[PDB]
Design a protein around this nucleic acid. Structure first.
Length: 47
DNA sequence: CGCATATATGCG
DNA sequence: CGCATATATGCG
C-alpha cells in the first residue's frame, strides 16, 4: 500500500508526512544534509 | 537497480 | 490538467 512516512528533522524541529514523491520540505532536507539522513529519521504510518 | 503505479510540486 | 521531475512501495 501507499504507506505514509513521517519524517522529523533533528536540526530544525520540523516534521512532515508523505507517501513518497517530489515534496518541498523533504527536498530541502535532502539538499541540506542528504537522503540517507532523511530516510534514517523516518517513521512508518498506516494512515 | 530497473520497472510499474500512486503519490506530489512546479512550469506551462 | 499535461507534462517534467522526483520518489516511496512493491515486483523481480
Amino acid at each position: 500500500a501507499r504507506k505514509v512516512k513521517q519524517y522529523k528533522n533533528p536540526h530544525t524541529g520540523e516534521v512532515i508526512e508523505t507517501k513518497g514523491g517530489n515534496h518541498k520540505t523533504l527536498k530541502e532536507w535532502k539538499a541540506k544534509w542528504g537522503p540517507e539522513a532523511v530516510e534514517s529519521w523516518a517513521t512508518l504510518l498506516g494512515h
